[PDB]
Enzyme design. Structure first.
Site, PDB file in Angstrom:
ATOM      1  N   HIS A  38      18.747  -0.989  18.608  1.00  0.00           N
ATOM      2  CA  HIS A  38      17.518   0.022  17.611  1.00  0.00           C
ATOM      3  C   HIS A  38      16.231   0.682  18.227  1.00  0.00           C
ATOM      4  O   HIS A  38      15.894   1.351  17.355  1.00  0.00           O
ATOM      5  CB  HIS A  38      16.703  -1.220  16.360  1.00  0.00           C
ATOM      6  CG  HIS A  38      15.909  -1.946  16.688  1.00  0.00           C
ATOM      7  ND1 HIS A  38      15.903  -3.045  18.006  1.00  0.00           N
ATOM      8  CD2 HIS A  38      14.587  -1.972  16.829  1.00  0.00           C
ATOM      9  CE1 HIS A  38      14.978  -3.956  17.737  1.00  0.00           C
ATOM     10  NE2 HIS A  38      14.152  -2.834  17.813  1.00  0.00           N
ATOM     11  N   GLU A  57       6.978   2.579  41.833  1.00  0.00           N
ATOM     12  CA  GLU A  57       7.824   3.098  39.798  1.00  0.00           C
ATOM     13  C   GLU A  57       8.922   4.303  40.788  1.00  0.00           C
ATOM     14  O   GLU A  57       8.887   4.689  41.971  1.00  0.00           O
ATOM     15  CB  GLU A  57       6.586   4.361  39.381  1.00  0.00           C
ATOM     16  CG  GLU A  57       5.661   3.383  39.027  1.00  0.00           C
ATOM     17  CD  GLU A  57       4.508   3.889  39.593  1.00  0.00           C
ATOM     18  OE1 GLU A  57       4.842   3.953  40.825  1.00  0.00           O
ATOM     19  OE2 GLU A  57       3.354   3.700  39.060  1.00  0.00           O
ATOM     20  N   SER A  78       7.011 -12.455  21.110  1.00  0.00           N
ATOM     21  CA  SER A  78       7.122 -11.038  21.474  1.00  0.00           C
ATOM     22  C   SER A  78       7.148 -10.676  20.354  1.00  0.00           C
ATOM     23  O   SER A  78       6.833 -10.922  18.999  1.00  0.00           O
ATOM     24  CB  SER A  78       8.660 -10.958  21.779  1.00  0.00           C
ATOM     25  OG  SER A  78       9.698 -11.239  20.028  1.00  0.00           O
ATOM     26  N   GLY A  96       6.995  -3.152  20.393  1.00  0.00           N
ATOM     27  CA  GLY A  96       7.020  -2.861  21.691  1.00  0.00           C
ATOM     28  C   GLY A  96       7.041  -3.926  22.738  1.00  0.00           C
ATOM     29  O   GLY A  96       8.183  -2.694  23.574  1.00  0.00           O
ATOM     30  N   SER A 136      10.516  -5.088  22.363  1.00  0.00           N
ATOM     31  CA  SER A 136      12.068  -4.429  21.427  1.00  0.00           C
ATOM     32  C   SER A 136      12.982  -4.248  22.816  1.00  0.00           C
ATOM     33  O   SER A 136      12.595  -2.801  23.480  1.00  0.00           O
ATOM     34  CB  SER A 136      12.056  -3.183  20.323  1.00  0.00           C
ATOM     35  OG  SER A 136      10.811  -3.354  19.699  1.00  0.00           O
ATOM     36  N   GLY A 137      13.924  -4.494  22.781  1.00  0.00           N
ATOM     37  CA  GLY A 137      15.012  -4.333  24.406  1.00  0.00           C
ATOM     38  C   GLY A 137      14.951  -4.851  25.169  1.00  0.00           C
ATOM     39  O   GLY A 137      15.274  -4.946  26.144  1.00  0.00           O
TER      40      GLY A 137
HETATM   41  C1  LIG Z   1       8.223  -2.270  15.501  1.00  0.00           C
HETATM   42  C2  LIG Z   1       9.894  -2.163  14.956  1.00  0.00           C
HETATM   43  N1  LIG Z   1      10.051  -4.334  15.458  1.00  0.00           N
HETATM   44  C3  LIG Z   1       9.527  -4.782  16.005  1.00  0.00           C
HETATM   45  C4  LIG Z   1      10.282  -5.527  16.539  1.00  0.00           C
HETATM   46  C5  LIG Z   1       9.793  -7.205  16.658  1.00  0.00           C
HETATM   47  C6  LIG Z   1       9.898  -8.606  17.246  1.00  0.00           C
HETATM   48  N2  LIG Z   1       9.513  -9.336  17.136  1.00  0.00           N
HETATM   49  C7  LIG Z   1       9.104 -10.668  16.397  1.00  0.00           C
HETATM   50  N3  LIG Z   1       8.814  -9.916  14.863  1.00  0.00           N
HETATM   51  N4  LIG Z   1       9.156 -11.610  16.252  1.00  0.00           N
HETATM   52  C8  LIG Z   1      11.261  -8.276  18.304  1.00  0.00           C
HETATM   53  C9  LIG Z   1      11.052  -6.769  18.009  1.00  0.00           C
HETATM   54  C10 LIG Z   1      11.459  -5.664  17.547  1.00  0.00           C
HETATM   55  O1  LIG Z   1      12.012  -4.653  17.694  1.00  0.00           O
HETATM   56  C11 LIG Z   1      10.187  -1.356  15.041  1.00  0.00           C
HETATM   57  O2  LIG Z   1      11.474  -1.651  15.705  1.00  0.00           O
HETATM   58  O3  LIG Z   1       9.812  -0.173  13.799  1.00  0.00           O
HETATM   59 CA   LIG Z   2       3.296   2.610  36.812  1.00  0.00          CA
HETATM   60 CU   LIG Z   3      11.647  -3.204  16.491  1.00  0.00          CU
END
Ligand SMILES: C[C@H](/N=C/c1cc(NC(=N)N)ccc1O)C(=O)O
Ligand SMILES: [Ca+2]
Ligand SMILES: [Cu+2]
Length: 223
Positions: free
Chosen positions: A40, A62, A172, A175, A177-178
């Site tokens: 995603h 970096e 988490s 932000g 994410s991934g």
């Molecule tokens: C911003 C939104 N993603 C939210 C997001 C939230 C969590 N965490 C959580 N709800 N405990 C983990 C990974 C994610 O990508 C998106 O993809 O638009």
């Molecule tokens: Ca830096």
């Molecule tokens: Cu997300």
């Protein structure tokens, strides 16, 4: 990361920042040419940033390398987030050192109760918004399959696992994410989804990496 701590510069050498003019997702370096992130988090024009701590300041360790190819899992379903995993190949091999290193893939799945390390540059607020510039860390245990399914009725597949604290306060967030979920020195999870951040009875849900080792190996073997 909500309720976590400042990791310490480069103490998570496999953590990468995906940049498209700004940091938008985390990722994990699995070897000098490949990164594992969430499906995603997909988008074009990705530049992988390694050896990062403060993402808004060039501190000297970096390595910025553009992605040459992105491969979202064949069965990724954005509706259910099942199979939320993506491979990113770098245009050039990263120079591995003490501050830029790969994380091993698992041979077996992690056990419930295991304490893992989750990291990222995501929101640090449960109610509100605040983004850190330096990498944040969180120690969180893998929750029981039973508890996970009870928290998200009819939404948890065999390719997902919950980790965190049901009492809320630590989790988490947007932000992160991934990003990585490392347990026993192995990349066992990918920050995937949840319901809000650090909310009670709503732990974070993560992609179960151990179910994708065959796909990862076959994919990097032909790309
Ligand atoms: C911003 C939104 N993603 C939210 C997001 C939230 C969590 N965490 C959580 N709800 N405990 C983990 C990974 C994610 O990508 C998106 O993809 O638009
Ligand atoms: Ca830096
Ligand atoms: Cu997300």
């Amino acid at each position: 990361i909500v309720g976590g701590y400042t990791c310490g510069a480069n103490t998570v050498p496999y953590q990468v920042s995906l940049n498209s003019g700004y940091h938008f997702c985390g990722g994990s370096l699995i070897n000098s040419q490949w990164v594992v992130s969430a499906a995603h988090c997909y988008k074009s024009g990705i530049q992988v940033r390694l050896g990062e701590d403060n993402i808004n300041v060039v501190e000297g360790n970096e390595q910025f390398i553009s992605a040459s190819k992105s491969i979202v899992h064949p069965s990724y379903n954005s509706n259910t987030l099942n199979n939320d995993i993506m491979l990113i190949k770098l245009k050039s091999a990263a120079s591995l050192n003490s501050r830029v290193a790969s994380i091993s893939l698992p041979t077996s799945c992690a056990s419930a109760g295991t304490q893992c390390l989750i990291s990222g540059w995501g929101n640090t607020k449960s109610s509100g918004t605040s983004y850190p510039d330096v990498l944040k860390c969180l120690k969180a245990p893998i929750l029981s399959d039973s508890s996970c399914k009870s928290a998200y009725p009819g939404q948890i597949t065999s390719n997902m696992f919950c980790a965190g604290y049901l009492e809320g306060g630590k989790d988490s967030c947007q932000g992160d994410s991934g990003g990585p979920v490392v347990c026993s020195g192995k990349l066992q999870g990918i920050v995937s989804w949840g319901s809000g951040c650090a909310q009670k009875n709503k732990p974070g849900v993560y992609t179960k990496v151990c179910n994708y080792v065959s796909w990862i190996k076959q994919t990097i073997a032909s790309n």
